[PDB]
UniProtKB/Swiss-Prot annotation:
Catalytic activity reported: Release of N-terminal amino acids, preferentially methionine, from peptides and arylamides
EC number, as in UniProt: 3.4.11.18
Region of the whole protein represented: 110 to 478 of 478
Gene that specifies this protein: METAP2
Source species: Homo sapiens (Human)
Function: Cotranslationally removes the N-terminal methionine from nascent proteins. The N-terminal methionine is often cleaved when the second residue in the primary sequence is small and uncharged (Met-Ala-, Cys, Gly, Pro, Ser, Thr, or Val). The catalytic activity of human METAP2 toward Met-Val peptides is consistently two orders of magnitude higher than that of METAP1, suggesting that it is responsible for processing proteins containing N-terminal Met-Val and Met-Thr sequences in vivo.
Name of the protein in its database record: Methionine aminopeptidase 2
Cofactor: Co(2+); Zn(2+); Mn(2+); Fe(2+)
GO molecular function terms noted in the UniProt entry: aminopeptidase activity; initiator methionyl aminopeptidase activity; metal ion binding; metalloaminopeptidase activity; metalloexopeptidase activity; RNA binding
Cofactor note as given: Binds 2 divalent metal cations per subunit. Has a high-affinity and a low affinity metal-binding site. The true nature of the physiological cofactor is under debate. The enzyme is active with cobalt, zinc, manganese or divalent iron ions. Most likely, methionine aminopeptidases function as mononuclear Fe(2+)-metalloproteases under physiological conditions, and the catalytically relevant metal-binding site has been assigned to the histidine-containing high-affinity site. Also manganese has been proposed to be the physiological cofactor for human METAP2.
GO biological process, any: regulation of translational initiation
Keywords assigned by UniProt, alphabetized: Acetylation, Aminopeptidase, Cytoplasm, Glycoprotein, Hydrolase, Metal-binding, Phosphoprotein, Protease
Amino acid sequence: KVQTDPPSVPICDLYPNGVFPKGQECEYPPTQDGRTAAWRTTSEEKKALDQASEEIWNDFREAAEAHRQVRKYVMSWIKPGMTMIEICEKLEDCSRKLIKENGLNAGLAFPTGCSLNNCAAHYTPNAGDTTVLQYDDICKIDFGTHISGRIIDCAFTVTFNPKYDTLLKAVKDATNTGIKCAGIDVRLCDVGEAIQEVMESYEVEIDGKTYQVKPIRNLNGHSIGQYRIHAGKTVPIVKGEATRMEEGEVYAIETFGSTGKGVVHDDMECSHYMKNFDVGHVPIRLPRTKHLLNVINENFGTLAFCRRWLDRLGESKYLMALKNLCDLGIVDPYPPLCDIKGSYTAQFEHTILLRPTCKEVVSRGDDY
Ligand SMILES: Cc1cnccc1-c1cc(C(F)(F)F)cc2[nH]ncc12
Ligand SMILES: [Mn+2]
Ligand SMILES: [Mn+2]
């Protein structure tokens, strides 16, 4: 069994044995003593510990492979002229097929971000959005797959005008630097500072104007828990918190470079929502509010969703119910995050596994 073109064969059918390809495996960075972390590779207790979680790592790997094949398909057809809705639906169709969506056991981990230009994150079109991708646009494609709530959060930036090449390069390098600086026992602030240093070593010229690339100070990498995109620990992308990464944790390492102020504010119409992982059970009598929470619980649990995904489930006239869920604090809204009008923002993101034996850039590909 080989993959089709366009991709339509689920990843689990491509590996009948249930063993999925590993990401990039790295040795952890040396400690402040200068001492190597190579011992972890050959340790008996670490090899045992790592094997105990093989099913889990293997789940991430399935999700990551879907992600690789999905984004490769996307890069081949994404073109200005297409509506943002058309882009998202086409990516998502492919993603459903390859992840072999199965309710909460396998599916899409969060909505397809395609934030444009000054907007950096959390934009996906709601129904009726007639936005079209433009030749001069800079588009952040950020989408997620999961298997059993093992989430791949992974993103790259799409352009068509070579004028942004260096901006994209700055951010790619910054993201790779964070990935490199990350490891067990590493201070989150140190990763932040390292990321900043690389990002800011780049200058770019866009339409006769120059800028030093700035990290977006109020955006960050994050710990990943099960069915939980942000698990509590944040990774600064500026010089931050001295809390340390720990063995067995999973991280989204993401950076954002901007030609703007290097700060985002909530802007535009909201599309992204997600249940508060900490909210307990709440009885609701209000019929449409109760119905919508039920739909959310059955379909997304604690995974993020968007309004388009409610439309496709056949829900309508739900806006008030959704607002109610937000106001009650059962659901949280995640509106698009934008730097100043006229700025350009870029993003690259990988998920990494802090395995006892090594660091695995599980979502790494030939592409980035
Ligand atoms: C939950 C959260 C908390 N603090 C910062 C970011 C996010 C987040 C939210 C979503 C969203 F919008 F889908 F809920 C997707 C994300 N990808 N990476 C981080 C992330
Ligand atoms: Mn992401
Ligand atoms: Mn993320």
